[PDB]
Amino acid sequence: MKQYLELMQKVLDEGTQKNDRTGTGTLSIFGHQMRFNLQDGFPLVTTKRCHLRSIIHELLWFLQGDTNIAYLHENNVTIWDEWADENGDLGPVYGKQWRAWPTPDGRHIDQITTVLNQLKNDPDSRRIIVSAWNVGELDKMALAPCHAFFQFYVADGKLSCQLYQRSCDVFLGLPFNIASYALLVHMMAQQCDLEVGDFVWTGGDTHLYSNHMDQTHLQLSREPRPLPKLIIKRKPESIFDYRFEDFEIEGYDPHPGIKAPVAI
Amino acid sequence: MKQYLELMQKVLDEGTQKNDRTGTGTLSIFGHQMRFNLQDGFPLVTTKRCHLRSIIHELLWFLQGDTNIAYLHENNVTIWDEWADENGDLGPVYGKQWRAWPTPDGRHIDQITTVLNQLKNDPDSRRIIVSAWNVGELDKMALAPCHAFFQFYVADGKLSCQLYQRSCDVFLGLPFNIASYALLVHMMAQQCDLEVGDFVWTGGDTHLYSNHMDQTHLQLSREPRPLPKLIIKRKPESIFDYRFEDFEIEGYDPHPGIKAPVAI
Numbered sequence: 001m002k003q004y005l006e007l008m009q010k011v012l013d014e015g016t017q018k019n020d021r022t023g024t025g026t027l028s029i030f031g032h033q034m035r036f037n038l039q040d041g042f043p044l045v046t047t048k049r050c051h052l053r054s055i056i057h058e059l060l061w062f063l064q065g066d067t068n069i070a071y072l073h074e075n076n077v078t079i080w081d082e083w084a085d086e087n088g089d090l091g092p093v094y095g096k097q098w099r100a101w102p103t104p105d106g107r108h109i110d111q112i113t114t115v116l117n118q119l120k121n122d123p124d125s126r127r128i129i130v131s132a133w134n135v136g137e138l139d140k141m142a143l144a145p146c147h148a149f150f151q152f153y154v155a156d157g158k159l160s161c162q163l164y165q166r167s168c169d170v171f172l173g174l175p176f177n178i179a180s181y182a183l184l185v186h187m188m189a190q191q192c193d194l195e196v197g198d199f200v201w202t203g204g205d206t207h208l209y210s211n212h213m214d215q216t217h218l219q220l221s222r223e224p225r226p227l228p229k230l231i232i233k234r235k236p237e238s239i240f241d242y243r244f245e246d247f248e249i250e251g252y253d254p255h256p257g258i259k260a261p262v263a264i
Numbered sequence: 265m266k267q268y269l270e271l272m273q274k275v276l277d278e279g280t281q282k283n284d285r286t287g288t289g290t291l292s293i294f295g296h297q298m299r300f301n302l303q304d305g306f307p308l309v310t311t312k313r314c315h316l317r318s319i320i321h322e323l324l325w326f327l328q329g330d331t332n333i334a335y336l337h338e339n340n341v342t343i344w345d346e347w348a349d350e351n352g353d354l355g356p357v358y359g360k361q362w363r364a365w366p367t368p369d370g371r372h373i374d375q376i377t378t379v380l381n382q383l384k385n386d387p388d389s390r391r392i393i394v395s396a397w398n399v400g401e402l403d404k405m406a407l408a409p410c411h412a413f414f415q416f417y418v419a420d421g422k423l424s425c426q427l428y429q430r431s432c433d434v435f436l437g438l439p440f441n442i443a444s445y446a447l448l449v450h451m452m453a454q455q456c457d458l459e460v461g462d463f464v465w466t467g468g469d470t471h472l473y474s475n476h477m478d479q480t481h482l483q484l485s486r487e488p489r490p491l492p493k494l495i496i497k498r499k500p501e502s503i504f505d506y507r508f509e510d511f512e513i514e515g516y517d518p519h520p521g522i523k524a525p526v527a528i
């Protein structure tokens with residue numbers, strides 16, 4: 001995509017060399033923002049083939065409140081294997097925080113449902129937020145949330161969403177992250193009878209790993225194809241009732257895939 | 265400031281009229297970002313006179329972990345009077361979350377001490393975050409945190425900071441918020457022997473209240489003057505030992521202040 005490819009070029013143009021947790025090395029910039037008008041098409045990267053099956057399943061898994069990779073495994077998704085323990089557990093990550101953030105007084109807050117109720121009864125609210133950044137539970141998580149905070153907004157009957165990603169692996173992570181959230185916005189809009197607005201992405205430490213340089217330049221030499229279209233074939237009773245089969249992506253003609261190593 | 269005035273104009277040109285919580289009505293946009301190179305000077309608005317004493321005392325108050333406006337009154341600061349209760353308390357707002365985030369099991373996390381230690385021991389970390397968005401205590405707060413999430417970053421010996429503000433009153437709140445965070449970066453940089461970098465401001469619902477239009481138009485016709493310079497006269501034993509007496513602003517020649525009512 002145009003915005004995505006411009007971000008890569010920017011990282012290469014004004015990024016600083018930084019050492020990191022993984023010990024790989026990164027080219028990095030701090031602070032960036034880009035907007036995607038969902039009415040223009042589904043933002044799935046076309047300059048390289050993306051695996052939508054894994055994106056959809058991870059999202060349904062998040063919405064279930066699940067943090068064990070069993071579900072992902074029976075659906076042949078292995079993107080989370082490197083961080084899970086002997087029992088397949090990842091700790092109180094995304095899924096748990098979204099559906100059951102623990103309060104100090106013994107309660108548990110379902111942020112997804114509260115957001116659904118806000119979009120319906122108080123769409124003008126400036127507090128329609130979901131956070132995965134639970135300071136008091138970070139030590140129990142296999143990995144600290146990258147996409148850790150997001151806010152919804154309604155205007156002219158359209159639903160918008162802004163995500164704050166503290167750490168961003170521009171080559172591997174980002175294409176997955178954008179499609180993941182664009183899909184959630186579509187599901188939320190269908191449940192609240194709203195049209196799709198903009199998906200605004202904001203990043204903290206936006207980086208490109210040292211071992212992804214050749215792949216990055218290979219992708220940059222490609223011209224983006226027209227954005228695919230998302231067709232939802234059903235309207236479930238709840239946001240938690242979607243199935244993989246309810247989604248149809250048409251007009252997706254990408255450039256060949258480019259393989260790259262993940263930094264654990 | 266240049267970029268501040270540009271945002272002010274943007275809200276006027278592209279804002280959507282929304283009936284807000286107060287019932288006053290706003291003109292708003294969703295998703296915006298501004299960068300301030302702190303090496304160029306302290307980002308304190310010159311198109312109108314802003315007062316540093318309220319800004320400085322509120323920040324020191326935050327770092328104390330205090331949530332009662334008693335301290336603020338001793339120093340003639342009244343900004344939190346309309347939201348405080350009969351006893352002067354605001355509930356577990358900013359200060360409490362920064363210094364003593366409560367875990368579900370009764371413990372407390374000192375986000376500021378953690379951040380200090382990360383900057384000093386692991387500067388390349390992509391997890392140097394402070395969050396005031398405690399979902400479990402939101403209902404106990406007099407007002408949900410506006411400037412709710414911030415991340416620090418180190419590169420080339422320079423300290424940068426990005427703040428995520430979910431709701432922003434462009435006229436009254438914004439000038440305060442920017443200067444408040446620019447100040448913290450300076451205190452942090454001094455305590456961690458680093459040079460200052462960029463202050464990145466990211467906003468969600470960025471608005472302009474309808475009863476501030478005349479004041480906005482007035483300010484928009486004033487030419488911005490060169491930015492001031494912040495001088496920290498004494499280096500305390502810790503980040504918690506700063507006093508109002510330690511801060512000085514040189515070369516601040518602003519246009520006269522503009523009065524405007526607050527929407528409670």
Ligand SMILES: CN(Cc1cnc2nc(N)nc(N)c2n1)c1ccc(C(=O)N[C@@H](CCC(=O)O)C(=O)O)cc1
Binds near residue numbers: 050079080143262263
């Ligand atoms: C969201 N996710 C989890 C996750 C957790 N730790 C990480 N750690 C690093 N350093 N980078 C990541 N992107 C990453 N992301 C991902 C996303 C994509 C791939 C990945 O290998 N993607 C390939 C192949 C996808 C596939 O396996 O089918 C692609 O091009 O899409 C791995 C993990």
Ligand SMILES: CN(Cc1cnc2nc(N)nc(N)c2n1)c1ccc(C(=O)N[C@@H](CCC(=O)O)C(=O)O)cc1
Binds near residue numbers: 312521524527
């Ligand atoms: C950061 N802060 C806290 C705070 C809490 N609730 C709010 N609620 C509303 N809607 N607006 C705010 N700006 C606001 N902000 C503020 C910021 C500015 C002023 C204020 O009135 N400031 C100057 C403004 C002077 C000027 O306009 O030039 C003054 O002394 O009157 C009050 C509280």
Ligand SMILES: O=c1ccn([C@H]2C[C@H](O)[C@@H](COP(=O)(O)O)O2)c(=O)[nH]1
Binds near residue numbers: 146147174177390391
């Ligand atoms: O959805 C995701 C998950 C992870 N990452 C990346 C960010 C970092 O490259 C690495 C996590 O390392 P830390 O930032 O936690 O140190 O994984 C993404 O880009 N997207």
Ligand SMILES: O=c1ccn([C@H]2C[C@H](O)[C@@H](COP(=O)(O)O)O2)c(=O)[nH]1
Binds near residue numbers: 408
């Ligand atoms: O530091 C602050 C505190 C408050 N506000 C503003 C934002 C909104 O105008 C109002 C809070 O209202 P809600 O967004 O919670 O509705 O005060 C700021 O801009 N900055």
